[PDB]
Amino acid sequence: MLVLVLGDLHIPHRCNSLPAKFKKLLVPGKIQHILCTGNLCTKESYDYLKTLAGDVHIVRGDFDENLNYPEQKVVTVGQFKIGLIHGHQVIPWGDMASLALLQRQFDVDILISGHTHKFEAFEHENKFYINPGSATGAYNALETNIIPSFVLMDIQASTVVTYVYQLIGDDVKVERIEYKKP
Amino acid sequence: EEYTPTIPPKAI
Amino acid sequence: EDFADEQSLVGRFIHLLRSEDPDQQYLILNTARKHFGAGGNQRIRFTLPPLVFAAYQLAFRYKENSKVDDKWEKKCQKIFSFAHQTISALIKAELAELPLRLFLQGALAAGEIGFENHETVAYEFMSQAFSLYEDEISDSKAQLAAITLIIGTFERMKCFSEENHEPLRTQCALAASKLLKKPDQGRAVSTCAHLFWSGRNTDKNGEELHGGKRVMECLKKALKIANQCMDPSLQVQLFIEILNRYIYFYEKENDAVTIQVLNQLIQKIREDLPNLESSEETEQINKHFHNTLEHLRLR
């Protein structure tokens, strides 16, 4: 089981495609699940996601024209109950206490959110929080040096290894973080 | 510890 | 759907426009909207909004050349004026959701850049987002969606003086207390609490307001609204949400949240929670209340 976590592409509003090297890495038949935080913001990007994996889950971003996407989603992948939301709903934006408030509501082991365009992966109160950032590296008013990034989760029973891919200059660079459920 | 930019990654 | 080729077109357009230097980007954007304006009302839904976001990016790009080019503040004013006209062209085409959201984005950008007369630009863009909220939106869940964005956007703003911050502040609380359905009022009014706590004006030396009495008024008014709801499921679901909101301010060192207030509400949920239907909905509500109690047990 491995899960691609990405979002805030903002195509065509702020970007026109994923960077060159990301389109090369992201190709069919390698990834089982995709959890997407939203702001695609169109079918052209959706249908591209639909040919990367069978099971693709998407929540509604603030600029998605599609209403059929739910506000939030909880899905289970192995032992982890995972929570998905775009994060424009979480006020103040990117606030820890508000994000944990939302973890208690869904009752999830991992919370994925993405309104900030800023990658974050960390444990807090024995519970895990992912923000994949913007996979296109899209403009945000509140953060000026946006690094194009996505996340690959490698789930095995009661453990998760999250890998963060980042486009720094021309180079794709990877870091790894590991969370075990109590 | 570094990792390759591949899917999935591998170690150095 | 149909306009994949037109979106992909404007997609390419903006990408290539990054090659042109800032002075020329403005000129080319102004002819772009002239061209894209010809295509009528259903096309401009998809082709104009990228021009508004490029207008915002361009404005940031001029702030980078601040010490090179001393006419940078007039240039920003000009771009925001262009953005205002481009967003207004979407309104005449009978749109509301998108331009409201584009207006909020413009208020954020103006506030962050800091060009002379930015506060006035930011206010206009915010007040324009409010008009579209009031005059052109009335579907309870779309209302709640819109006003959470206005509130969440406004909460990040730090460019307003108290004289402008206050009318906007109380308008959010007013607007929130008048949504169509009672459960959505409870949420919105409690969401407003964050405006009085973590909202910034320019009188405080950039510091957060911390108006704890107003924080409570919102929550007391959020509870009042929860009592009068039309479903025991939603009534309690909202009681547990407001409890977590008190806990948010309790942990942030708000004097006005005392342990007495929490205990009153957890007992109130203990009384009413057994009087619900056995369901998937009330199992998640029970697990939510347990998670809250477990959270209060630590810290």
Q: Are B5 and A30 inside 8 Å of each other by CB?
A: no
Query: What does the DSSP 8-state code read for residue C56?
Result: H
In order of A88, B7, C54, C83, the CA distances from C47 in angstroms are 24, 35, 12, 13
In order of A12, A16, A23, C8, C15, the CA distances from A19 in angstroms are 14, 9, 7, 15, 12
Chain A contact present for C258, CB below 8 A? no
Has domain C1-299 been given CATH number 1.25.40.660? yes
Q: Are C191 and A91 inside 8 Å of each other by CB?
A: yes
**Length reported for chain C:** 299
- Which residues of B are less than 8 Å from A175 in CB distance? 3
Q: Which domain holds residue A172?
A: 1-182
Chains that touch C (3 or more CB pairs under 8 A): A
Q: Can you tell me the distance from the alpha carbon of A21 to that of A24, in angstroms, rounded to the nearest whole number?
A: 5
Mention every residue, 6+ apart, whose C-beta is less than 8 A from residue C263.
none
φ, ψ at C144 (rounded to 5°)? -55, -40
Instruction: Map chain A to HEC letters.
Output: CEEEEECCCCCCCCCCCCCHHHHHHCCCCCCCEEEECCCCCCHHHHHHHHCCCCEEEECCCCCCCCCCCCCEEEEEECCEEEEEECCCCCCCCCCHHHHHHHHHHHCCCEEECCCCCCCEEEEECCEEEEECCCCCCCCECCECCCCCEEEEEEEECCEEEEEEEEEECCEEEEEEEEEECC
Tokens found for residue A101: 């408030």
- Which residues of B are less than 8 Å from A154 in CB distance? 8
Q: Are C101 and A104 inside 8 Å of each other by CB?
A: no
Q: Are A92 and C151 inside 8 Å of each other by CB?
A: no
Q: Can you tell me the distance from the alpha carbon of A6 to that of A56, in angstroms, rounded to the nearest whole number?
A: 11
Q: Are A93 and C148 inside 8 Å of each other by CB?
A: no
**Length reported for chain B:** 12
Contact C227, C272 (CB under 8 A): no
Shortest Cα–Cα distance, B7 to chain A (Å):
6
Report how many domains make up chain A: 1
Q: Are A42 and C4 inside 8 Å of each other by CB?
A: yes
- Other C-beta atoms closer than 10 Å to the C-beta of C169 total 21
Q: How determined? A: X-ray
Contact C48, C33 (CB under 8 A): yes
- Search chain A and give the residue with CA nearest C195: A92
Q: Can you tell me the distance from the alpha carbon of A103 to that of A99, in angstroms, rounded to the nearest whole number?
A: 6
Strands A72-77 and A110-112: unpaired
Angle at which helices A96-106 and C232-251 pack, to 10 degrees?
150
- CATH number of the domain enclosing A58: 3.60.21.10
* Angular region, A87: left φ>0, alpha ψ -120 to 50, beta rest: left
Chain B contact present for A161, CB below 8 A? no
Chain A contact present for B1, CB below 8 A? yes
Contact A105, A94 (CB under 8 A): no
Mention every residue, 6+ apart, whose C-beta is less than 8 A from residue C125.
C80, C84, C103, C104, C106, C107, C110
* Adjacent-strand bridge partners of A154: A2, A161
Q: Can you tell me the distance from the alpha carbon of C197 to that of C251, in angstroms, rounded to the nearest whole number?
A: 13
The owner of tokens 């923000």 is A131
> Which of 200-239 (C) contact A at CB < 8 A?
none
Chains that touch B (3 or more CB pairs under 8 A): A
- Other C-beta atoms closer than 10 Å to the C-beta of C162 total 12
Q: What resolution in Å is listed for this PDB structure? A: 2.5
Annotated binding site of A: 8, 10, 39, 62, 86, 115, 117
- Other C-beta atoms closer than 10 Å to the C-beta of C194 total 22
Touch criterion met for C and A (3+ Cβ pairs within 8 Å) = yes
Report CA A82 to chain centroid distance, whole Å: 12
